[PDB]
Design a protein around this ligand. Structure first.
Ligand SMILES: *[C@H](C)[C@H]1/C(=C/c2[nH]c(/C=C3N=C(/C=C4\NC(=O)C(CC)=C4C)C(C)=C\3CCC(=O)O)c(CCC(=O)O)c2C)NC(=O)[C@@H]1C
Ligand SMILES: *[C@H](C)[C@H]1/C(=C/c2[nH]c(/C=C3N=C(/C=C4\NC(=O)C(CC)=C4C)C(C)=C\3CCC(=O)O)c(CCC(=O)O)c2C)NC(=O)[C@@H]1C
Ligand SMILES: *[C@H](C)[C@H]1/C(=C/c2[nH]c(/C=C3N=C(/C=C4\NC(=O)C(CC)=C4C)C(C)=C\3CCC(=O)O)c(CCC(=O)O)c2C)NC(=O)[C@@H]1C
Ligand SMILES: *[C@H](C)[C@H]1/C(=C/c2[nH]c(/C=C3N=C(/C=C4\NC(=O)C(CC)=C4C)C(C)=C\3CCC(=O)O)c(CCC(=O)O)c2C)NC(=O)[C@@H]1C
Ligand SMILES: *[C@H](C)[C@H]1/C(=C/c2[nH]c(/C=C3N=C(/C=C4\NC(=O)C(CC)=C4C)C(C)=C\3CCC(=O)O)c(CCC(=O)O)c2C)NC(=O)[C@@H]1C
Ligand SMILES: *[C@H](C)[C@H]1/C(=C/c2[nH]c(/C=C3N=C(/C=C4\NC(=O)C(CC)=C4C)C(C)=C\3CCC(=O)O)c(CCC(=O)O)c2C)NC(=O)[C@@H]1C
Ligand SMILES: *[C@H](C)[C@H]1/C(=C/c2[nH]c(/C=C3N=C(/C=C4\NC(=O)C(CC)=C4C)C(C)=C\3CCC(=O)O)c(CCC(=O)O)c2C)NC(=O)[C@@H]1C
Ligand SMILES: *[C@H](C)[C@H]1/C(=C/c2[nH]c(/C=C3N=C(/C=C4\NC(=O)C(CC)=C4C)C(C)=C\3CCC(=O)O)c(CCC(=O)O)c2C)NC(=O)[C@@H]1C
Ligand SMILES: CC1=C(/C=C/C(C)=C/C=C/C(C)=C/C=C/C=C(C)/C=C/C=C(C)/C=C/C2=C(C)C(=O)CCC2(C)C)C(C)(C)CCC1=O
Lengths: 160, 161, 150, 67, 161, 160, 160, 161, 160, 161, 160
C-alpha cells in the first residue's frame, strides 16, 4: 500500500517520512471513503463486469474463442473469465490501498512469464482488462470511475 | 513488510475472496486512526534526536553502562548505542504509521537477539532504555498516539527479551 | 597482491568488457547487421544481472536505460553494477525484507563475491546504512578499494 | 542530475597484463556529480591522467533543481 | 531537472529575495494549468503503447526505413527504435507535467544528436515519427493539452535535429 | 518540487507516473492557492517573525550573544538573524514547492559542515527554527499552520 | 561464422587459436561445398517451401488468420509470409556461415520486443519456422536435412 | 568484427537478397584460401614468441629507446613493449584468419593512438618494430601468406600513424 | 601499541615485520623507561593538570559556564572535568604504548557523534585538550614535553 | 608520487648515471630538513581545520562569493568549497613532507582547472583563498617550514591559475 | 621510500600522517646518513665489485660465456656486465631510499619476461646477483653488508 511504499522509500533513504510523504498519506486517509465506495461497487457488481467484459472481449477478438485459440472450449472460456475475475479483484485491492503495489505483487510480476508458459495472448488479457474498465466506469459516477480507471490503466499498460 | 491495509489485502487474497464487509470495517477503522498516526509521525520526525537524548539521560547517563568497563563506556560504544536507539525510534515510528508490527520483525527482531548475544550487549539495559523511550516519546506525542508508540516499543522490548 | 588473479578452472567464470562494445567506433560506418560483437556484451549484461540478482529478471524488471548506456559506452561495468544494485528492484527484493545486518552481509557477498571478514567491515557498512542509506551503502561497497582491485 | 563526462588514461604499474586492457586504459565515462570527487581521487591514486572533464548534464551554478 | 516551481524558486533565490508578484503570477499560471497537465499525463500513460504503435504504423512501417537496407531493418534496430520512441513519449510527458523542457535537455538532449549521427540514425525520419506521435497524442488528449504536450515534443524533436 | 520528485522516481523505475503520484500532483495543484497564501503571509510578515524568534532564541540561550559566543556583538547577532531569515525564505520555498527538494538543495546539504566551520551550534539553530515555527503558527491561520509546521519540522530535523 | 566464433573465444581467453579449433575450421572449410549446397537448394526452393509452410501453419493455427488475429487479411497474410521468407533467408545465412550468430544478429535479437509491439504471436512464428524446417527436411537429403535441423531448431528454441 | 563470410552475408542482407552467384564465388574463394590461412596461423601460433624476439632484436635493441632515457629503458616498459608486439602479432593473425581488418579496427586501433599519445610511446619506433615483425613473419611463413600478413600489419601501422 | 601497529601493517601486507619496524620496536623498548617517566609525571599531575586546563578553558569561553551553555551548573562542570581526566588518562596510555590506537578506540572514533547527542561544543573540547597540553608541557621536561605533545596534538586534530 | 629521494633517483636514472655529488648533496639537504618537515607537518595536522576555518573568513566570508547568487551561497556549495580548501591544505602538507611537488601535480592539478571552469568556480577567488590559507599556515608553522608550505601552496595556486 | 609509503597510506585513509608514521619518517631521515655512506661505498667500488662478480659468475657458469651462449663474445660479455652494473645501481638506489620500491619499479618488474625474450637464463642472472652480493659484503662492513643484503636478497628472490 501507500503506507508501505512510503516506509520503504524512507528507510531506503534512511530517514523518517518527509512532509510530502506524510501529506500524501493523510490525503489518502481522508479520501479513503471514495475508495471504499469504489471497492463496494466493484465487488457487488463483479459478476456483471466480468460477464460484460468477457462478452465484449470475445466479440472484439473472436479468434481467442476460435478453434486453435487459447480460450477455445467451455473450460478454456471459464478459465478466461476466472483470470478476469482475479484481475478485477486485484484492481479492487489497488483501489482500496491507494497504490498498485498489491496488484504488482500478486498479478503483475512475472505475468509475462506465466502467460507465455500457458500460451496466452497478453495483449488479449490487456484488452479484457480494458473492457472491464469500461464496464466499471459505466457502472460508477464520472469522477469516481475517472479515478478508479487509473488502476485499470496501470494494469493495461503493464500487460500490454 | 505489511501495513494494516496490506494485512487485510493479504488475508482476502490468500482466501481468494473479494473485500467483504469486515475488511471494509477494518479499513475504515485504519482510515479513522490515520490522521492521528500522521501527526505522531510528524512530531517524532521533528524531535527524533531529542527524544533519544532524554531517553538516555533518564535511563543510562551516570550509570554502570556509561562507566568504564560497561558496554557503553567508550565513545565508539556510545555511538553504537545511539545508533541502536535511533534504529529503534525510526522503526517504531514506521510501525506506528503503518499500523503494523511486521516491519520490526522483518528488519529489527529477525536477528537482533542473536546479534546482542554475540556482541555481549546488555539486553536488560537496552530494554530499560527503550522503556524510558516509551515515556519520553509519549510526552511529546500525546496519550493515544503515545499508547500506540508504547505498543510498538513494548514489541521491541519483548523481541529483545 | 593476487586479488586480481583470475580463478582459472577452480573458481566461477569471470565476465569482462574485453571486446569492444558495438558502435564504440565509427569504423563500422552504419549498417553492418552482422557486427559480431554484441552477443558478448548482451551476455555480459545478463551475467551482471545474474550476479547482482542471483537469477534472471523478468521482462519489466530489466534496466533498459542503464543497459543501453553500458552498451553505448557512456558508463563502465562498475557503474552498470552500481545502477543495478541501487535499482529499487534490488531494494525491494533483497534489502527491505531482511534484517539490516543480514541484508548488508548478502549485499557484500553479492557485490564482492566474498563474505565479510567480520566486525570491522560490518561496522563500516553499518554506520553507512545508519547515516546515509541503502544507496550510500551500495555506493561504499562498490567504491571500496577491494572492489576496485578484484 | 548533474553528470560529468570524463576521459582519462590510467596506466598499469605492477603487473604486465596479457589481456586486452585498452578499454580501461583510455576511456570516457559518465560519472555522477555526487561520485565525481571520489572517482577523480581514485584515478589520481591509481596514477591516471585526466585528459578531459565536461559537465554533460545540467548547467553551472544551479542553486535548486540540480536533481 | 527544473520544473515550473523549481525554476521559479531558483529565479527567486539567485536574486536572493522572497517570492514576488512576478513569480507569483507564473506560479498562479502553473497551478491553473496543473489540472490539464495531470489529465493529459493520465491519458498518455493509459495509451502509451498504443500511441507509439500506431505512430510507427502510420509513419515508418512498410517504408524504406523498415525495409532491408534501412536503418530500422534488423530486429534489434527495430526494437531500439521502438524503445527510443517510448522514451521520447515518456520524457515528453514528464516535460508536460513539469512545465519545462529542462528535463528533456538533461536526460534526452545530452549526447543524442552526436550519438544518432555516429550511428547513422535518420534525423529527419525520427522527426516525422515524433510528429506522428505528437499528432496521435494530441488527437487522444485534446486540442489544448495536445498542443501543450506537442510544444515539448517539438522542442525535443528540434533539439535532436 | 513534489512533481519533480514524482518525475525522478518514475524515471528511476523507467515507468510513467503512478496513479497515486498523479492524484498527489492534482491535490497539490488544487491546494496551490492555500500554499501560495501561506507563502504571501510569511513573505509579508517575515521581519516580525524572524525578530520574535531571534529574541526568544536569545533569551533561551543568551550564550551566543554572550561574550565568547559564536554570534557576539550587534554585527554577529545581525548575522544570526540573517541566517534565520534565510531559513524562513527556504521554508517559504519549500511550502510553495510542496517538497523538501529546494530546502535540501539550498540550505541543508553540507550545512552541518558549514556550521561546524562557522562554529555555530546547529542545535541552537534548530531551536531558533523551532521558535520561528511557533511565532509563525501564532501569526497565521491554524489550518495553514499545520502545513507550514510540516516543513518547519522537516527543517528542524535536518538541522538537528 | 565458425572462424569468427573461434577468433572471439580465442581473444576472450587471450590466446592463439587452439589446434582443435584450427582443425574444426579446416574441416568446416573442407566441407564448405556440401554446406553451401544446402544454401543453394534453399535459395532455389524458397518460394515453394515458404508457401507450403505458410499453408501448413495456417492449417495448424487457423486462429491467427481468423478475424481479429494478427495475420487476418490478405495484406497481413502477405506480410506474415514475408517474415517467413526473412527467416528462411536467415537460416540460409546461418547454414552458409556454419554459425547461428548471423541468425541471432539480424533476425533473433529483439524479436520478442518487435512481435510484442506488432501484436504477433511468437508461438505462431515458432510453429511456422517448425513447418519450414519440416518442409526443408522433406525437400533435402537426410544428412543435409539433419544438418539444417540444427539451425532450424536453434531458431525454434530462441523463438520459444 | 566481420570476416570474409560475414562481409558477404552483410552485403547480401543490406539489399535483402539471398546469396547470389557473386556471394557464392566469394565464399568459395575464402574457402580456397582457408587452408593457407590456417597453416600460417598455426605456424605463427607455434613460433609467436620467437618472431617477436627477432623483431625486437632487429628493430629496437641497442638504440636510444632501449638505453636509459628511452621509453623502453625500464624493465616494466620493455615488458610492455614485448606485450604490445605480441598483441600486434596475435591480432594480425586474427585478421589473417578472418580475411578482414574489422577486428583490427574495432579492438587494436580503437584508442591505441590516443593512449600512445598520452603515455608518450614513440609512434615511429613502434611502427618500425611492427614493420620488422612483418619481415620476420613473412620470412617464417613464406611469401604467399606473408604478403597478406604484411598487408594487415601495414594496416595497423597506417592506423597507428 | 607500536608493536600492534607494526604487526597489523605487516599482517595486512602479508609479510614479516620490516627491519625498520624491528628497529623502531627496539628503540621503543629501550626508551620505555623514559616513557614510563613521562606517564608517571602525568599521573602525578593528574588532579592539577586537568584543573588548570579547565580553569583556562572557562576563562577563555565563558559561555560554557554562562547561561545557555552546555556545561551550566556544578554537576556539568564536574562532568566536564571528568572528560578532562579521561582524555588525560588516554594520553597516558598512548605515551606508554607508543601508539595512538589505545587513545582513539577508547575516546576518539565517533567522538563527534558521541558528543553531538550531548550537545557539547566539539571545538570547545578541543580547546580544553589544547589547554591540558600546555599545562602538561609546563609541568614536563623539554624533550618529553614534545613527545607527549605529538600525541596531544594528534588527539586535538582528530577531535577538533 | 615522488619524494626528494625518489626525484633524485629518477633524475639520475634518466641519464643512467650513479648518485653523483649533486645527488648526494641534495639527498643530504633533504635529510637535514627532514626533522623540520616532520615537525611542521605535525603542527599543521594538529589544527588543520582551524587554518581553513579562519582563512575563509579572512578571504571569502561576508563576500560576494558566499552571498546569494555567488558560487558559494548554498550550504552544499560552501561545503564543497571548504572540502576543496581542506584537501588543498592537506595535500600541501603531504608535498612538504615528501619534499617534491610531484604529488601535487599527480593528486590535485590533474583536471581541477577544467573541473572548476565547467562548474563556474572563480579562479581568482579560489587562488585568493589559497593565499589567505598560506599566510596563516606560515604564522602557525614558523619561518622556514612556513616558507616551504607557502612554496607548495603557491605551486597549487599557479596550477589552478 | 618509507616517506612515499606513509604518504600513500595517509592519502588512502584520507587523513594526516599518524604520530607513529612521523616517528618512522624521522628515524628514516636520521639513518639516511648511514644509508648514504653505504651507497657511496657501493658506488665507489662499483667497478671492482662488477668485475669480480662477473669473473666469478663466468667461472661458475662458463657456458654462458662459452660459444653458443648468450654471453659469448665481447659484445655479449659487455652487455652482461652492463646488466650487472644496472642491478648494482638499482641496489644503491634501494639502499639510499631505504626501500626496494625504486629497484622493483626500475629493473625488477617483468624481468622474467624480458630475459625470456632475450634468451638470458634467469638462473644465471640470480646467481650473478648473488655473486655481486657476496663481493659487496666482503668489501663492506658486516652491519652495512647486512643492510645491503636485504636489497640483494630481494633482487635475487624476485629473479628466482
Ligand atoms: C568538558 C571539557 C566539556 C564538557 C563536558 C561534559 N560531558 C558531559 C557528559 C559526558 N561526557 C562523556 C564522555 C566520555 N565518557 C567516556 O567514557 C569517554 C572516554 C573515557 C568520554 C569522552 C559521557 C559519556 C557523558 C555522559 C555522562 C556520563 O558519562 O555519565 C557533560 C554533561 C552532559 C549532560 O547533560 O549530562 C558535560 C558538561 N562540557 C563542556 O562544555 C566542555 C567542552
Ligand atoms: C544501546 C541502547 C545499548 C547497547 C548497544 C550496543 N550495540 C552495539 C553494537 C552493535 N549493535 C548492532 C545492531 C544492529 N544490527 C542490526 O542488524 C540491527 C538492525 C537490523 C541492529 C539494531 C550491531 C550490528 C552492532 C555491531 C557494531 C560493530 O560491529 O561495530 C554496541 C557496541 C559494541 C562494540 O563492541 O562496539 C553497543 C554498546 N549497549 C548497551 O549497553 C545499551 C543498553
Ligand atoms: C527510431 C525512432 C529510429 C531508430 C532508432 C535506433 N536507435 C538505436 C540505438 C540507440 N538509441 C539510443 C538513444 C537513446 N538512449 C537513451 O537513453 C535515450 C533517452 C534517455 C535515447 C534517445 C541509444 C543510446 C542507442 C544505443 C546504440 C545501439 O544501437 O546499441 C538503434 C540501433 C542501432 C544499431 O545499429 O544498433 C536504432 C535503430 N532507427 C530508425 O530507423 C528510426 C528513425
Ligand atoms: C507470420 C509468421 C506472423 C505474422 C507476421 C507479421 N509481421 C508483420 C510486420 C512486420 N514483421 C516484421 C519483421 C521483421 N523485419 C525484419 O527485417 C526481420 C528480421 C530480418 C523481421 C523478423 C517487421 C519489421 C514488421 C513491420 C512492418 C513491415 O514489415 O514493414 C505483420 C503486420 C501486423 C500489422 O498489423 O501491421 C504481420 C501480420 N503475423 C502472425 O500472426 C504470424 C505469427
Ligand atoms: C613496443 C613495440 C613499444 C612500447 C611499448 C609500450 N607500451 C606501453 C603501454 C601500453 N601499451 C598498450 C597497448 C595495448 N593494450 C591493449 O589492450 C592493446 C589492444 C589489444 C594494445 C595495442 C596499452 C593500453 C598500454 C598502457 C599500459 C598497459 O599496458 O596497461 C608502454 C608503457 C607502459 C607503462 O606503464 O609505462 C610501453 C613502453 N614502447 C616503445 O618504445 C615501443 C615502440
Ligand atoms: C543564528 C540563528 C545562529 C548563528 C549564525 C551564524 N552564522 C554565521 C555564518 C554564516 N551563516 C551562513 C548562512 C548560510 N549558508 C548557507 O549555505 C545557507 C543557505 C544557502 C545559509 C542560511 C553563511 C553563508 C555564513 C558564513 C559567513 C557569512 O555569512 O559571511 C555566523 C558567523 C560566525 C563567525 O563569523 O565566526 C553566525 C554567528 N550563530 C549562532 O550561535 C546562532 C544559533
Ligand atoms: C572554494 C575554495 C571555491 C569553490 C569551490 C567549488 N568546487 C566545487 C566542486 C568541486 N570541487 C572539486 C575539487 C577537487 N577535486 C579533486 O580531485 C581535488 C583534490 C582532491 C579537489 C580539491 C570537485 C571534484 C568538485 C565537483 C563536485 C564535488 O563535490 O566533487 C563547487 C561546487 C559548485 C556547484 O555548484 O556544484 C564549488 C563551489 N567555489 C568558490 O566560490 C570558492 C572560491
Ligand atoms: C649478465 C649477468 C647476464 C646476461 C646479460 C645480457 N643482457 C643482454 C641484453 C639486454 N639486457 C637487458 C636488460 C635491461 N635493460 C635495462 O635497461 C634494464 C633495466 C634495469 C635491464 C634489466 C636489455 C634490455 C637487453 C637488450 C639489449 C639492450 O641492452 O639494449 C644480453 C645480450 C642478449 C643478446 O642475445 O643480444 C646479455 C648477454 N646474459 C647472461 O646470460 C647473464 C645472466
Ligand atoms: C481445434 C483444436 C484442437 C482439437 C482438435 C480435434 C477436435 C481433434 C480430434 C480429431 C478426432 C475426432 C480424431 C478421431 C480419430 C478417430 C480414430 C483415429 C478412430 C479410428 C477407429 C478405428 C481405427 C477403429 C476401427 C474399427 C475396427 C478396426 C474394429 O475392429 C471394429 C470396428 C471399429 C470401427 C471400431 C486441438 C486439441 C488440437 C488444439 C485446440 C483446438 O482449438
Amino acid at each position: 500500500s501507500i503506507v508501505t511504499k512510503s516506509i520503504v522509500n524512507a528507510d531506503a533513504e534512511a530517514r523518517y517520512l518527509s512532509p510530502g510523504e506524510l501529506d500524501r498519506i493523510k490525503a489518502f486517509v481522508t479520501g479513503g471513503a471514495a475508495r471504499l465506495r469504489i471497492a463496494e461497487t466493484l465487488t457487488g457488481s463483479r459478476e456483471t463486469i466480468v460477464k460484460q467484459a468477457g462478452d465484449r472481449l470475445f466479440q472484439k477478438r473472436p479468434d481467442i474463442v476460435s478453434p486453435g485459440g487459447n480460450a477455445y472450449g467451455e473450460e478454456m472460456t471459464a478459465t478466461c473469465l476466472r483470470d478476469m475475475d482475479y484481475y478485477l479483484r486485484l484492481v479492487t485491492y489497488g483501489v482500496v490501498s491507494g497504490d498498485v503495489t498489491p496488484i504488482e505483487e500478486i498479478g503483475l510480476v512475472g505475468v509475462r512469464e506465466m502467460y507465455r508458459s500457458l500460451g496466452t495472448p497478453i495483449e488479449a488479457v490487456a484488452q479484457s482488462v480494458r473492457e472491464m474498465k469500461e464496464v466499471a466506469s459505466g457502472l460508477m459516477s464520472s469522477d469516481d470511475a475517472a479515478e478508479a480507471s487509473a488502476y485499470f490503466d496501470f494494469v493495461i499498460g503493464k500487460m500490454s | 513488510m505489511q501495513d494494516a491495509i496490506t494485512a487485510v489485502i493479504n488475508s482476502a487474497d490468500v482466501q481468494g475472496k473479494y473485500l467483504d464487509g469486515a475488511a471494509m470495517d477494518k479499513l475504515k477503522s485504519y482510515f479513522a486512526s490515520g490522521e492521528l498516526r500522521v501527526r505522531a509521525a510528524s512530531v517524532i520526525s521533528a524531535n527524533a534526536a531529542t527524544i533519544v537524548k532524554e531517553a538516555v539521560a533518564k535511563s543510562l547517563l551516570y550509570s554502570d553502562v556509561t562507566r568504564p568497563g560497561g558496554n557503553m563506556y567508550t565513545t565508539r560504544r556510545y555511538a553504537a548505542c545511539i545508533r541502536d536507539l535511533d534504529y529503534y525510534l525510526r522503526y517504531a515510528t514506521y510501525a506506528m504509521l503503518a499500523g503494523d508490527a511486521s516491519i520490526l520483525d522483518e528488519r529489527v527482531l529477525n536477528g537482533l537477539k542473536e546479534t546482542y548475544n554475540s556482541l555481549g550487549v546488555p539486553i536488560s539495559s537496552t530494554v530499560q532504555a527503550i522503556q524510558a523511550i516509551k515515556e519520553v516519546t509519549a510526552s511529546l506525542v500525546g496519550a493515544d498516539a503515545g499508547k500506540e508508540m508504547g505498543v510498538y516499543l513494548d514489541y521491541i522490548c519483548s523481541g529483545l527479551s | 597482491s593476487a586479488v586480481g588473479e583470475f580463478p582459472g578452472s577452480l573458481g566461477a567464470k569471470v565476465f569482462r568488457l574485453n571486446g569492444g562494445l558495438p558502435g564504440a567506433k565509427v569504423g563500422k560506418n552504419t549498417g553492418t547487421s552482422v557486427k559480431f560483437g554484441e552477443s558478448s556484451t548482451q551476455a555480459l549484461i545478463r551475467a551482471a544481472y545474474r550476479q547482482v540478482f542471483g537469477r534472471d529478471l523478468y521482462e519489466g524488471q530489466r534496466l533498459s536505460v542503464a543497459e543501453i548506456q553500458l552498451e553505448n559506452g557512456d558508463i563502465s561495468v562498475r557503474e552498470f553494477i552500481k545502477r543495478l544494485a541501487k535499482s529499487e528492484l534490488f531494494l525491494k527484493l533483497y534489502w527491505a525484507p531482511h534484517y539490516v545486518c543480514k541484508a548488508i552481509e548478502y549485499m557484500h557477498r553479492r557485490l564482492l563475491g566474498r563474505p565479510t571478514y567480520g566486525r570491522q567491515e560490518m561496522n563500516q557498512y553499518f554506520d553507512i546504512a545508519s547515516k546515509q542509506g541503502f544507496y550510500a551503502v551500495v555506493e561504499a561497497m562498490i567504491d571500496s578499494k577491494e572492489y576496485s582491485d578484484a | 542530475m548533474r553528470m560529468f563526462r570524463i576521459t582519462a588514461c590510467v596506466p598499469s604499474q605492477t603487473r604486465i597484463r596479457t589481456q586486452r586492457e585498452l578499454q580501461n586504459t583510455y576511456f570516457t565515462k559518465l560519472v555522477p556529480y555526487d561520485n565525481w570527487f571520489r572517482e577523480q581521487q581514485r584515478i589520481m591514486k591509481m596514477g591516471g591522467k585526466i585528459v578531459k572533464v565536461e559537465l554533460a548534464t545540467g548547467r553551472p551554478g544551479t542553486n535548486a533543481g540540480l536533481a
